[PDB]
Design an enzyme around this catalytic site. Structure first.
Site, mmCIF file in Angstrom:
data_model
loop_
_atom_site.group_PDB
_atom_site.id
_atom_site.type_symbol
_atom_site.label_atom_id
_atom_site.label_comp_id
_atom_site.label_asym_id
_atom_site.label_seq_id
_atom_site.Cartn_x
_atom_site.Cartn_y
_atom_site.Cartn_z
ATOM 1 N N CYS A 19 0.805 -1.226 0.000
ATOM 2 C CA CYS A 19 0.000 0.000 0.000
ATOM 3 C C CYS A 19 0.837 1.274 0.000
ATOM 4 C CB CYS A 19 -1.050 0.012 1.113
ATOM 5 S SG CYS A 19 -2.210 -1.376 0.987
ATOM 6 N N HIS A 21 2.267 -2.556 6.393
ATOM 7 C CA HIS A 21 1.656 -1.657 5.436
ATOM 8 C C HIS A 21 2.337 -0.310 5.582
ATOM 9 C CE1 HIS A 21 -2.487 -3.366 4.309
ATOM 10 N NE2 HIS A 21 -1.878 -4.337 4.966
#
Length: 308
Positions: A6, A75
């Protein structure tokens, strides 16, 4: 560690401070976006900063404390942390003396073409090298297509009994080889963009048999390889017997991340060398050779001699 998922989503609010709104087509010019792999948002930000503005992050262009780039649960995200980025208008003002159209570029998300001083729409071929960075070694200016190198003979000559080959398959006559790869015949099958798995054992020799394609410039090839140095070569130190050896394919350290990574690795070994064996024909390709893990007992000058 530095590669997480991400990263592109996390960069959206950072890039927006400089007027940049990436389309899917533009994101596809970041190789790990097209292939859906974990990456460092900071390395990617540095890559886009050079592509858009001809300057790397050490210019301070994105140094304002506006948007966090944080790592949480594997992430990248924008959760609060001190690691904040954002267009710094004071830095823009300072740079505008030398680069008069740069304020327009950073207001509108246009490319500032360092060759002409004029504005362009995004194309990754416009700005190939950060003009603010003192390169630690010379770069290849004339790259050619060559057959792939074969490093079997090189690893066979190294001292050690057990070898972990990371990446593409490599037979090593006379040694006991385990193979870490995302290929089905691997000894340890894993996504290499997540790094060497922590449960992999310890070895006398680790050979990182991983290449990155040349597309636009030596600088591009090096910066595209940096994340692999971070997730593979740097983690090899967790998987070495005392006095062990790590050898890695590389392209020098044209970019700031590679320079930091290679320096950190080198401080953990008695000796660090750069080698370009006879089988290595691609002009930019070298082997980083780290000998004597956790023992005591010029890199840039060697790279300059190889690449000049």
């Amino acid at each position: 560690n530095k590669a997480n998922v991400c990263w592109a989503k996390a960069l959206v609010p950072v890039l927006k401070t400089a007027g940049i709104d990436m389309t899917t087509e533009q994101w596809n010019t970041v190789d790990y976006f097209e292939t859906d792999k974990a990456h460092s948002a900071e390395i990617v930000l540095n890559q886009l900063c050079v592509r858009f503005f001809g300057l790397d992050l050490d210019s301070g262009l994105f140094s304002a404390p506006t948007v966090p780039l944080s790592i949480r649960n594997n992430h990248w995200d924008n959760s609060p942390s001190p690691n904040m980025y954002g267009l710094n208008k004071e830095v823009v003002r300072q740079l505008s003396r030398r680069y008069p159209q740069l304020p327009r570029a950073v207001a509108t998300g246009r490319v500032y073409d360092m060759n002409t001083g004029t504005l362009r729409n995004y194309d990754p071929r416009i700005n190939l090298v950060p003009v603010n960075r003192r390169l630690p070694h010379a770069l290849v200016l004339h790259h050619n297509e060559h057959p792939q190198s074969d490093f079997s003979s090189f690893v066979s000559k190294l001292k050690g009994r057990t070898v972990l080959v990371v990446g593409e398959k490599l037979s090593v006559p006379g040694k006991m080889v385990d193979w870490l790869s995302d290929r089905p015949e691997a000894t340890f099958r894993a996504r290499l963009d997540l790094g060497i798995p922590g449960d992999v054992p310890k070895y006398d020799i680790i050979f990182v048999n991983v290449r990155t394609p040349y597309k636009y410039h030596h600088y591009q090839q090096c910066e595209d390889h940096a994340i692999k140095l971070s997730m593979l070569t740097k983690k090899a130190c967790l998987h070495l017997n005392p006095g062990g050896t790590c050898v890695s394919i590389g392209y020098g350290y044209a970019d700031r991340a590679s320079e930091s990574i290679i320096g950190a690795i080198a401080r953990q070994f008695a000796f660090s060398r750069v080698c370009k064996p006879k089988s290595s024909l691609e002009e930019t390709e070298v082997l980083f050779v780290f000998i004597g893990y956790d023992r005591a007992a010029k890199l840039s000058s060697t790279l300059t001699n190889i690449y000049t």
